[PDB]
Structure 1
Amino acid sequence: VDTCSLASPASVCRTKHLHLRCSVDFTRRTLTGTAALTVQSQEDNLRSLVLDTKDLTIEKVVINGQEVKYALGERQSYKGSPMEISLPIALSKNQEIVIEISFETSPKSSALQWLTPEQTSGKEHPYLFSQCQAIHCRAILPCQDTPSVKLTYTAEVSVPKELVALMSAIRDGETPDPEDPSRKIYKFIQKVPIPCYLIALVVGALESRQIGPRTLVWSEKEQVEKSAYEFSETESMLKIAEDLGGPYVWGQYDLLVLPPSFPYGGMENPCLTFVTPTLLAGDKSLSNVIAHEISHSWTGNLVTNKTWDHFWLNEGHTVYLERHICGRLFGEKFRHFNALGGWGELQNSVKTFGETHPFTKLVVDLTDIDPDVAYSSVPYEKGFALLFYLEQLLGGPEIFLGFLKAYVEKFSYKSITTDDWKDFLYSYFKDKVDVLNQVDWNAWLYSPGLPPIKPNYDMTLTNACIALSQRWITAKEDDLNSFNATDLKDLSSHQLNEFLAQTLQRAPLPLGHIKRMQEVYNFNAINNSEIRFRWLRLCIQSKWEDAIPLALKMATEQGRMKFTRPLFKDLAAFDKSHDQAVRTYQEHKASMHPVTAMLVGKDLKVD
C-alpha cells in the first residue's frame, strides 16, 4: 500500500507508457495539453480506475476516440484530488488501452516554479523548472503517482521559439510549431521504465557545453564557463560508478545548473541531473553532490523504493556509492572523513527532531504525513550508517561492494521494500548469517534516535578539525590572542567546513570568540556555500548582530532548502532579527519556490 497515493495500486492496473503533448504558457503560467496513458489491467473485468491529480483542470478524457465519464473527488490536503475514470469497455487481465486526458496545470502547481525575467541571470526571458520528488508529479499531469509503477515516456513540448525545453529523457529533435510560428516543439524519448517522480522539465534561455564523451552541462549563458569547470570530474565519476554498479543504461549523462531557487542540492532526473548553482564554489570542492546524483542512476533510478516509507533504500545506498566514488578519487582516508562527517549530520538531525521522534526512524510510516515535511538527513545518514556498519561486519568494502553490484543487478527495473532488500542481503551473505543475526534489525530499521551501534571511522583527517574546534570552545578571553590565520594553514576547505560543523554543534560560543574568529580567519570572505552557511549559523546563534544582513542575504539570494530553512529559523530564534526574518519571508513568499515557501512558513509559524 502506497499511503501517499490516491490512485489505483499496481495490483489493479499499471501505467506502461505516457505520451505527453503540451504547451508552456508563460503569460498564464500554465502547462496545457494531453497526457496519453497506456494502461495495462492487472484484474479481470476492470471497469474503472483512479489517478492522482493536484490542482489540475480537466477538460476531458478520451478513450477509443470518444469522451468518457470521470469524476474528481474531494481534495485530501497535500495528496491532491483523486480522479476516477469510467472505462467504456471492461478489460481482461493484461489488456492494455490508451487513455487520453486533456488538462491544464494551476499557476500554483507545487511541482513548478515559474520565474520572471528579473529572477533569471540574463534578465530578458522567463524560466520554468519542475521538481516532482516525492509526490508532485500529480501537480503536473494525471498519473499513478507512486514509485511502485514504472513507465516509459515520450513528450512533445511547445515553447516560445527563443527558449529551450529539456526533460529527463533523450532529446529527439526540434521543429517550428505548426499551430504557432512564434513557437518551437521539442521532442523527447525515455526508453527505460522509470517511476513518475523522475519526470522533469525545464524551459528557459539555455546554452550547453560539452564536458565529457556523454555529458553536456546546461545553464544560462552567464554560468556555462564556471559550470563546465566545476563539474569537469563528471566523466571520471561515471566510470567509477559503472565499475561499482554495472552498465550505465541511460545513454546520456547531462547536467543542468538551475537558478538559485532550486530547492535541493541535486535531483537525479534520468539523462539530465538537476543541480543547485550553490555548487559553484570555483574549486570543484562540492563535487560529492555530482557523485551522489550519478550514483542514483543505479540506486534509486534502476532499483527504486516501492513506497516513500522505504526512501532510505534510495538514499542510503546512494550515499554509500557516493562516498566510494569520492574514496576512489581522493583516497580511503577521505571516504572515512566524509563518513564521520555524515554521522555528525545524523546527530544534528536526531537532536533537532528529538531522539524519540518518528521521523528519526529509518523506515518511516508516512500515513497522513506530507513527505515534504518528513524530509531530512535521516534516510541519507542513518541509511549510510547501516550500510557502513554492515560493510565492517561482513568483511570490508571489497566484499560489501560485491553485494551492492549483485543487489543492483537483482532488482534493476523493479520497485522494492526494505524486506526485499533484507531478504536479498541474507541470501547473498548466507555463509555469514550468524553475523547478520547479531544485528539489532528492529532497532536499526524501526526505532527512533541514533543507531544502536556506531561504526569505526579512521580519524586521520578529522583530528585537526576537532583539535581546533576544542581550542576555540575551551578558550577564555585571555586565550583569544593566540589564534591566528596560520591556524588554517594545512586545512582543506573540507576540513574548514568540518571545523565549523564541530563548533556549531556547541553553539552558541561567546560573542567575543566569534568576533575574534572573523578577525583572524576572515570567514566573511569565503563564498563556498557549505562553509558560509555554517559560519553564518554560528554567528547568528552566538548573537552577532553584524551577521544579520549577511544571513538574510544568503537566505534569500538562493533557495536551497538545506541552507534557506535553517538560516530563516536561526534568524527567527534571535530576538534582534526575529521581526526582520518574518518580514523578509512575507516579502519574498510570492516569488519563492512553492514547496520552500510552504516549509519556511511552517518553520517560522507564519500564516
Structure 2
Amino acid sequence: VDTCSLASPASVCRTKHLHLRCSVDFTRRTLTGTAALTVQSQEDNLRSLVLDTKDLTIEKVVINGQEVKYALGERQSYKGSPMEISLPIALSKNQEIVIEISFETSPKSSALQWLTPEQTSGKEHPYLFSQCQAIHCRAILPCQDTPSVKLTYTAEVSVPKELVALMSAIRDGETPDPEDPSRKIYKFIQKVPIPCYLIALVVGALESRQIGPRTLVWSEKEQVEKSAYEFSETESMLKIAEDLGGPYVWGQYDLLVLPPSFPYGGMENPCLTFVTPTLLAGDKSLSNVIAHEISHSWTGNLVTNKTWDHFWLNEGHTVYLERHICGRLFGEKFRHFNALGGWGELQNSVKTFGETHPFTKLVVDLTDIDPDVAYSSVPYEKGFALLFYLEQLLGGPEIFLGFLKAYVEKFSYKSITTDDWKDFLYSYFKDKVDVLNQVDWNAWLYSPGLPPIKPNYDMTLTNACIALSQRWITAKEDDLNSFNATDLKDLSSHQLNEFLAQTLQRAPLPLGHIKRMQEVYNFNAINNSEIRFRWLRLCIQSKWEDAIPLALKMATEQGRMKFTRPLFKDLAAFDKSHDQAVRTYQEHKASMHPVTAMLVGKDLKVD
C-alpha cells in the first residue's frame, strides 16, 4: 500500500504507457494537453479506477472515442485530489485500454517552476523546469503517482520556436507545429519502464556541447563552456558505474545545468540528469554529485523503492556506489574520507531532528507526512552507514560489490521493499547467515537515532582537518597570532570543507576567532559553494554582523535547499539578522521554487 498516493494500487490496475501531447503556455504559466494512459486491469470485472491529481483542471476523459464520467474527490492537502473514472465497459484481468485525459496545470503547480526572462542567464527568454520526485507528477498530469508502478512513455511537446524542450527520454526529432508556426514540437521516447517521478521536462533557450561518447551537456549559452569542463569526468564515471552495476540501459547520459533556483544538487532523470549550477566550482571538486546521479541509473531507476517509506533503498545504495566510483578515481583512502564525512552529516541530522524523532528511522512511515517535509540526509547516510557496516561484516568491498551487482540484476525493472532487499541479502550470503544474524536489524531499520554500530573508517585524510579544527576550538586569544595562511598549504578543497564541517559542529566560536580566520584564510574569497556555505553558517552562528549581507546574498542568489534552508534558519536565529531574513524571504517568496518557498516558510514560521 502506497500511503502517499490516492490512486488505484498496482494490485488493482497498472499503467503500462503514457503518451503525452502538450503545449507549454508561458503567457498563462500552464501546460495544456492530453495524457493517454494505457492501463492494464489486474482484476476481474474492473469498472472504475482512481488517479492522483493536484491542482489540475480536467476538461474531459475519452475512452473508445467517447467522453466518459469522472469525478474529482475532495482535496487531501499535499496529496491533492483523487480522480475517479467510470470505465465504459468492465475489464477482465490483464485487459488493457487507453484512457485519454484532457487537462491543464495550475501556475501554482508544485511540480513546476516558471521563470521570467530576468531570472535566466540570457535575460531574453523565459524558462520552465519540472521536478516530480517524490509525489509532484500528479501536479503535472493525472497518473498513478506511486513508484510501485512503472511505465514507458512517449511525448510531443509544443513550445515557442526559439526555445528547446528536453525530457527524461531519448530525443526523437523536432518539427514546426502544424497548428501554429510560431511554435515547435519536440518529440521524445522513453522505452525503459520507469516510475512516474522520473518524468521530467525543461523548456528554455538551451544549447548543448558534447563531452563524451554518450553525453551532451545542456544549459543556457553562458554556462556551456564552464559546465563542459566541470563535468568532464562523466564518461569515466559511467564506465566505472557500468563495471560495478552492469550494463547502462538508458542509451544517452546527458546533463542539464539548471538555473540557480533548482532546489537540489542533482536529480537522476533518465537520459538527462539535472544538476545545480552551484556545482560549477571551476575545478571539478563537486563531481561526486555526478557520480551519485550516474549511480541512480541502477539503484533507483532500475531497482526502485516500492513506496516512499523505503526511500533509503534508493539513496543508501546510490551513495554506496557513488563512494565506490570516487574511490576508484581517487583512492580507497578518499572513499573512507567521504564515508567518514557522511557519518558526520548523519550526526548533524540526528542532532537537528532529535535522537528519538521518527524521521531518523531508516524505514519511515509516511502516512499523513508530506515527503518534502520528511526529506533529510538520514536515508542517504544511515542507509550508507548500514551498507558500509555490512561490507565490513561480510568480508570487504569486493565481496559486497558482488552482492550489489547481483541485487541490481535481481530487481531490475521492479519496485521493491526493505523486506525484498533483506531477503535477497540473506539469500545471497547464505554461507554467512550466522554473521547476518548478529546484525541488530530492528535497531538498524526501525529505531530512531544514530545506528547501533559505527563502521571502521580509515582516518588518514581526515586527521589534518580534525587537528586544525581542534587548534582553533582550543585556541585562546593569545593563540590567534599563531594561525597563518600556511596552515592550509597541504589541504585539498575537500579537506578545507571538512575542516569547516568539523568546526561548524562546535559552533559558535568566539567572534574574535572567526574574524581572525577571515584575516588569515580569507574564506570570504572562496566561491566553492560547499565551503562558502559552511563558512557563512559558521560566521552567522558565531554572530559576525559583517557576514549578514553575504549569507543573505548566497541564500537568495541560488536556491539549492541544502544551502538556502540552513542559511535562512541561521539568519533567523541571529537576532541582528532576524527581521532581514523574514523580510528577504517575504519579498522573494513569489519568485522562489514552490517547494523551496513552502519549506523556508515553515522553517521561518512565516505566512
Task: Name the TM tier (shorter chain).
Answer: over 0.9
Q: 1:23-57: per-residue Cα shift (whole Å, max 9, x none)? A: 00000000000000000000000000000000000
Structure 1 gap ranges (5+)? none
* Mapped partners of 1:181, 1:510: distance in 2: 64
* Mapped partners of 1:179, 1:277: distance in 2: 36
Q: 1:240-288: per-residue Cα shift (whole Å, max 9, x none)? A: 0000000000000000000000000000000000000000000000000
State the Cα RMSD in Å: 0.1
SS of aligned partner of 2:128: strand
* Mapped partners of 1:328, 1:528: distance in 2: 24
Q: 1:288-338: per-residue Cα shift (whole Å, max 9, x none)? A: 000000000000000000000000000000000000000000000000000
1:483 shift after superposition: 0.1
SS of aligned partner of 1:101: strand
Q: 1:152-196: per-residue Cα shift (whole Å, max 9, x none)? A: 000000000000000000000000000000000000000000000
1:13 shift after superposition: 0.1
* Mapped partners of 2:446, 2:560: distance in 1: 29
* Mapped partners of 2:178, 2:108: distance in 1: 29
* Mapped partners of 1:549, 1:438: distance in 2: 52
Q: 1:7 matched to which residue of 2?
A: 7
Q: 1:358 matched to which residue of 2?
A: 358
Q: 1:500 matched to which residue of 2?
A: 500
SS of aligned partner of 2:153: strand
1:451 shift after superposition: 0.1
Structure 2 gap ranges (5+)? none
* Mapped partners of 2:211, 2:433: distance in 1: 45
* Mapped partners of 1:449, 1:600: distance in 2: 25
1:11 shift after superposition: 0.1
* Mapped partners of 1:526, 1:74: distance in 2: 51
* Mapped partners of 2:41, 2:428: distance in 1: 34
1:517 shift after superposition: 0.1
SS of aligned partner of 2:181: strand
1:86 shift after superposition: 0.1
SS of aligned partner of 2:545: coil
Q: 1:451-490: per-residue Cα shift (whole Å, max 9, x none)? A: 0000000000000000000000000000000000000000
1:603 shift after superposition: 0.1
1:365 shift after superposition: 0.1
Q: 1:95-125: per-residue Cα shift (whole Å, max 9, x none)? A: 0000000000000000000000000000000
Using the size of structure 1 for normalisation, the TM-score is 1.00
1:216 shift after superposition: 0.1
Q: 1:567 matched to which residue of 2?
A: 567
Q: 1:404 matched to which residue of 2?
A: 404
Q: 2:243 matched to which residue of 1?
A: 243
SS of aligned partner of 2:256: strand
* Mapped partners of 1:403, 1:177: distance in 2: 50
Q: 2:263 matched to which residue of 1?
A: 263
* Mapped partners of 1:485, 1:443: distance in 2: 45
Q: 1:227 matched to which residue of 2?
A: 227
1:345 shift after superposition: 0.1
SS of aligned partner of 2:577: helix
Using the size of structure 2 for normalisation, the TM-score is 1.00
Structure 1 runs (4+) greater than 3 angstroms displaced: none
Q: 1:366-387: per-residue Cα shift (whole Å, max 9, x none)? A: 0000000000000000000000
* Mapped partners of 1:444, 1:429: distance in 2: 18
SS of aligned partner of 2:5: coil
* Mapped partners of 2:267, 2:122: distance in 1: 24
* Mapped partners of 1:311, 1:123: distance in 2: 38
1:72 shift after superposition: 0.2
SS of aligned partner of 2:471: helix
Q: 1:46 matched to which residue of 2?
A: 46
Aligned-pair identity (%)? 100
* Mapped partners of 2:473, 2:366: distance in 1: 40
* Mapped partners of 1:19, 1:528: distance in 2: 42
1:397 shift after superposition: 0.1
* Mapped partners of 2:357, 2:504: distance in 1: 22
* Mapped partners of 2:256, 2:282: distance in 1: 17
* Mapped partners of 1:34, 1:445: distance in 2: 42
Number of aligned residues: 607
1:559 shift after superposition: 0.1
1:524 shift after superposition: 0.1
SS of aligned partner of 2:182: strand
